[PDB]
Design a protein around this ligand. Structure first.
Ligand SMILES: O=c1ccn([C@@H]2O[C@H](COP(=O)(O)OP(=O)(O)OP(=O)(O)O)[C@@H](O)[C@H]2O)c(=O)[nH]1
Ligand SMILES: O=c1ccn([C@@H]2O[C@H](COP(=O)(O)O)[C@@H](O)[C@H]2O)c(=O)[nH]1
Ligand SMILES: [Mg+2]
Ligand SMILES: [Mg+2]
Length: 324
């Protein structure tokens, strides 16, 4: 197709999306007050990034203490004790949520690097609780900060996210490699390279100044019937197929300009020594975490999943990201 055609099939595909989180936030703070009344609740993830709440999206919360919040720029420990601490306080809160809401499924998730409690209410009321981590709110505010720069870019984002679940690329789907977060990191990196955004050093995001529940950010329709959205997609996909060099480069918001794998020691050699969650890390598709230490966000992109990613980045160019 063409920028225009793509733009219209996309605005068309979102048209019933354009047709209240405080209540959940409140519901949840109930259970935290019960565990410890001095304990803060922070919202993060797409709600906070986009300033809007989508259907098919959950809500991400983290429970923090006063001093975790005042240490607004501290890192998150990746020690075993940190993980012990976080699991101890999320077991109690889970116990409390179950004990206040019998219909709800409260699953204490332990597969992960980051201990999380997963809650389904049935009423498509969904959410994840984590404890004692700042990086979650820090990177969402960092991505929020950027999206406020150029608010219509949220459409490029939402368009990429939805397609990634649909393609089976998103970490939410079996066989998926990159989280929704990882994809936002690409959207932004791309827009940076192309000058639609101004660089914001990650270290200026100060948790002691973020809002626990930030204000809504009106999402408005593309007022050119999609031409800007359409030409950005066609270009985003061109950027990742023909401009970004996955063998020598790292998608990163840590520096403006290029970051190489060489300078990070994200190399073949590294892979042999590397391990994350009692398992291999891959350095095929490299996405540098703004805040975590030496964490590649596409560590699951096996040499084969890098095939599918290229495979899909090409089909998406002729299917308007699966809409026509
Ligand atoms: O590898 C990860 C994944 C997630 N996160 C933290 O979790 C937040 C939400 O993680 P999600 O990947 O669930 O993304 P999302 O909420 O933007 O979109 P949906 O797929 O839910 O519609 C992210 O924005 C980030 O703060 C990480 O820090 N690292
Ligand atoms: O670095 C991370 C990774 C995960 N999570 C939380 O745990 C859930 C599952 O993580 P993942 O399995 O998508 O990596 C996410 O929705 C999010 O709330 C984080 O806060 N930080
Ligand atoms: Mg989420
Ligand atoms: Mg998630």
């Amino acid at each position: 197709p063409s920028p225009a055609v793509v733009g219209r099939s996309l605005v068309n595909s979102f048209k019933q999306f354009v047709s209240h989180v405080d209540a959940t936030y409140r519901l949840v703070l109930d259970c935290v007050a019960a565990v410890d009344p001095l304990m803060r609740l922070y919202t993060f993830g797409s709600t906070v990034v986009y300033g809007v709440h989508e259907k098919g999206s959950d809500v991400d919360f983290v429970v923090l203490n006063k001093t975790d919040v005042e240490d607004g720029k501290g890192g998150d420990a990746a020690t075993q004790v940190a993980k012990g601490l976080q699991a101890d306080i999320l077991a109690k809160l889970a116990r409390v949520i179950r004990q206040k809401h019998l219909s709800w499924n409260v699953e204490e998730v332990r597969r992960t690097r980051v201990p999380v409690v997963r809650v389904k209410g049935g009423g498509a009321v969904d959410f994840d609780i984590t404890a004692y981590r700042r990086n979650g709110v820090r990177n969402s505010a960092l991505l929020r900060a950027y999206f406020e720069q150029n608010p219509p870019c949220r459409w490029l984002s939402m368009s990429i996210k939805r397609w990634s679940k649909q393609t089976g690329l998103n970490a939410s789907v079996i066989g998926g490699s990159i989280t929704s977060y990882g994809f936002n990191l690409m959207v932004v990196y791309y827009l940076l390279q192309r000058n639609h955004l101004q660089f914001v050093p990650p270290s200026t995001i100060d948790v002691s100044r973020v809002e626990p529940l930030p204000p809504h950010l009106p999402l408005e329709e593309p007022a050119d019937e999609g031409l800007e959205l359409g030409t950005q997609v066609l270009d985003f996909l061109h950027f990742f197929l023909h401009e970004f060099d996955s063998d020598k480069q790292v998608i990163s918001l840590n520096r403006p300009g290029i970051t190489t794998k060489e300078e990070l020691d994200w190399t073949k050699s590294a892979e042999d020594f590397a391990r994350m969650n009692g398992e291999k890390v891959h350095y095929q598709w490299c996405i540098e975490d703004p805040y975590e230490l030496n964490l590649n966000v596409g560590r699951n992109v096996t040499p084969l999943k890098r095939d599918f990613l290229r495979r899909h980045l090409e089909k998406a160019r002729d299917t308007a990201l699966l809409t026509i």
